[PDB]
Amino acid sequence: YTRVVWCAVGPEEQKKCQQWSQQSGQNVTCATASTTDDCIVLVLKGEADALNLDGGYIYTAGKCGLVPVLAENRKSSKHSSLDCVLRPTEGYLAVAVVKKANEGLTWNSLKDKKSCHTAVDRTAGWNIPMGLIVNQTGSCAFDEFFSQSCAPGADPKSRLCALCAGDDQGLDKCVPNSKEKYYGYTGAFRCLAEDVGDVAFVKNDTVWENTNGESTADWAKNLKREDFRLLCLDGTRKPVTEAQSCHLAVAPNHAVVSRSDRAAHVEQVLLHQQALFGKNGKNCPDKFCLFKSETKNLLFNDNTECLAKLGGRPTYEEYLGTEYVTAIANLKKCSLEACAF
Numbered sequence: 001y002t003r004v005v006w007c008a009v010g011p012e013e014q015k016k017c018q019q020w021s022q023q024s025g026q027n028v029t030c031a032t033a034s035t036t037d038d039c040i041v042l043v044l045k046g047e048a049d050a051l052n053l054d055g056g057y058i059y060t061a062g063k064c065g066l067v068p069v070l071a072e073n074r075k076s077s078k079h080s081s082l083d084c085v086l087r088p089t090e091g092y093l094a095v096a097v098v099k100k101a102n103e104g105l106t107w108n109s110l111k112d113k114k115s116c117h118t119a120v121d122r123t124a125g126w127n128i129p130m131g132l133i134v135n136q137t138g139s140c141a142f143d144e145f146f147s148q149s150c151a152p153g154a155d156p157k158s159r160l161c162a163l164c165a166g167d168d169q170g171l172d173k174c175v176p177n178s179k180e181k182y183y184g185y186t187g188a189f190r191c192l193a194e195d196v197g198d199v200a201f202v203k204n205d206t207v208w209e210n211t212n213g214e215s216t217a218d219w220a221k222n223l224k225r226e227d228f229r230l231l232c233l234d235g236t237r238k239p240v241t242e243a244q245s246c247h248l249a250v251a252p253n254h255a256v257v258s259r260s261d262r263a264a265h266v267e268q269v270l271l272h273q274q275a276l277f278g279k280n281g282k283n284c285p286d287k288f289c290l291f292k293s294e295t296k297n298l299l300f301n302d303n304t305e306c307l308a309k310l311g312g313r314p315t316y317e318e319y320l321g322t323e324y325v326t327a328i329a330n331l332k333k334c335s336l337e338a339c340a341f
């Protein structure tokens with residue numbers, strides 16, 4: 001058989017990947033790159049096999065010929081009798097989150113406010129909110145909309161990176177990897193929690209997972225759900241319990257992608273690796289947990305119960321959904337079928 005070469009984005013993911021590799025008996029090994037796009041390029045070159053991607057990155061990867069293999073499946077209600085690996089995914093809720101204390105901030109007064117984004121090109125953090133904003137403002141100048149932002153992956157000298165903080169030393173400001181303090185779901189929510197931004201573009205789960213003691217992290221320790229609100233598209237504000245009626249979109253779950261020629265083997269290896277290291281995994285938590293990273297969502301989201309089989313052997317467009325694909329396409333006209341590499 002062959003080994004599977006995972007691609008880790010940044011040095012923290014690399015550390016986790018190297019643990020996984022050690023525990024896997026080298027069935028999985030690790031390549032690393034600085035950005036998700038660079039990992040995609042490694043995969044395209046055949047120098048890595050696979051990584052797990054947000055839907056916006058799935059679009060990039062898809063255009064370049066990479067295919068979805070398995071999807072993250074979090075806890076559900078529905079389809080409650082089937083195994084996680086066979087339970088249909090549900091998709092996560094992209095939300096706009098503000099402080100309750102920031103009274104009178106709504107969707108319609110976001111202009112010239114400070115924003116926190118997971119990263120450029122990600123679903124909840126970018127594609128959905130900026131796609132909506134471009135459409136409603138009828139302008140492609142999404143780079144001049146918020147007074148300041150943290151939008152990892154944007155030009156570090158620009159207003160879209162002005163709120164980003166980098167790493168301990170204050171290097172890597174605005175890089176789109178976990179070295180950036182305000183990267184990703186948990187980083188963007190932290191940017192809001194610390195009042196660096198006025199609004200965070202994250203998902204519903206992020207808010208719950210980092211409040212009311214669900215996170216023991218210093219910046220999250222003491223956060224309370226009731227101190228946050230969601231911005232609905234109709235201009236109202238709701239408690240974070242109302243995400244099902246106050247979201248920006250429903251997003252397709254992050255999913256593993258590979259070259260088509262390696263998909264079957266990546267799939268088999270992953271199904272076995274999560275049997276060992278997944279949620280009820282034979283050797284998790286004693287040895288290693290693939291879906292834990294102390295809240296940092298490294299390699300996979302920490303709320304992943306399993307990687308689930310896809311159904312209909314879907315193309316990247318089918319997996320993302322035609323509506324989301326066209327929304328992305330429309331947005332990218334601002335910055336039209338390619339491989340961008």
Ligand SMILES: *[C@@H]1O[C@H](CO)[C@@H](O[C@@H]2O[C@H](CO)[C@@H](O[C@@H]3O[C@H](CO)[C@@H](O[C@@H]4O[C@H](CO)[C@@H](O[C@@H]5O[C@H](CO)[C@@H](O[C@@H]6O[C@H](CO)[C@@H](O)[C@H](O)[C@@H]6O)[C@H](O)[C@@H]5O)[C@H](O)[C@@H]4O)[C@H](O)[C@@H]3O)[C@H](O)[C@H]2NC(C)=O)[C@H](O)[C@H]1NC(C)=O
Nearest residue numbers: 075076077080093204205206208209214241242243244303
């Ligand atoms: C925004 O993001 C949040 C973070 O992801 C989401 O919150 C999380 O939601 C999930 C569930 O969607 C929660 O997971 C659960 O946590 C529970 C406690 O830790 C677990 O314990 C029990 O789980 C059972 C299964 O869900 C529940 O029992 C029931 O299920 C039975 C059988 O299906 C049903 O049967 C009925 O029961 C009735 C009782 O009176 C009876 O009258 C009827 O005749 C009928 O028999 C019924 O549905 C029942 O409720 C049980 O209640 C426990 O919950 C559970 O296994 C699961 O792991 C996370 O805890 C949430 N996380 C946090 C931090 O809150 C949030 O949902 C999301 N928002 C939106 C809108 O998507």
Ligand SMILES: *[C@@H]1O[C@H](CO)[C@@H](O[C@@H]2O[C@H](CO)[C@@H](O[C@H]3O[C@H](CO[C@@H]4O[C@H](CO)[C@@H](O)[C@H](O)[C@@H]4O)[C@@H](OC4O[C@H](CO)[C@@H](O)[C@H](O)[C@@H]4O)[C@H](O)[C@@H]3O)[C@H](O)[C@H]2NC(C)=O)[C@H](O)[C@H]1NC(C)=O
Nearest residue numbers: 127128129130131132134135322323324326327328330331
């Ligand atoms: C920012 O603005 C842009 C521009 O408005 C916007 O892009 C537009 O997005 C629209 C929504 O995706 C899109 O409109 C479409 O819907 C048509 C049908 O959608 C269907 O739903 C019904 C009901 O569930 C079902 O019958 C279908 O199964 C579809 O799921 C779609 O197609 C048609 O084909 C059908 C046959 O296959 C026919 O029955 C029917 O006659 C239609 O011809 C359209 O192709 C289209 O997807 C707009 O096209 C699109 N505009 C442009 C110019 O591209 C972005 O969405 C927005 N950004 C954000 C983030 O919101």
Ligand SMILES: *[C@@H]1O[C@H](CO)[C@@H](O[C@@H]2O[C@H](CO)[C@@H](O)[C@H](O)[C@H]2NC(C)=O)[C@H](O)[C@H]1NC(C)=O
Nearest residue numbers: 001002023024025026027028268269272273276
């Ligand atoms: C690494 O991958 C190999 C190949 O899939 C696994 O090998 C299994 O080994 C046991 C014991 O020799 C056999 O009974 C199985 O038949 C092998 N797998 C298959 C399906 O051929 C091995 O278990 C993996 N190790 C880890 C730690 O992941």
Ligand SMILES: OC[C@H]1O[C@H](O[C@H]2[C@H](O)[C@@H](O)[C@H](O)O[C@@H]2CO)[C@H](O)[C@@H](O)[C@@H]1O
Nearest residue numbers: 091252314317318319320321322323324
């Ligand atoms: O792959 C299943 C995905 O289903 C949805 O996608 C729909 C989409 O809503 C619609 O525009 C189109 O007509 O059909 C696709 C199915 O490919 C969601 O995008 C996701 O929840 C699912 O991954």
Ligand SMILES: [Fe+3]
Nearest residue numbers: 054055123124
């Ligand atoms: Fe995402």
Ligand SMILES: [Zn+2]
Nearest residue numbers: 001002003265
């Ligand atoms: Zn092999």
Ligand SMILES: [Zn+2]
Nearest residue numbers: 247248249250
């Ligand atoms: Zn909806």
Ligand SMILES: [Zn+2]
Nearest residue numbers: 312314315318
């Ligand atoms: Zn198909």
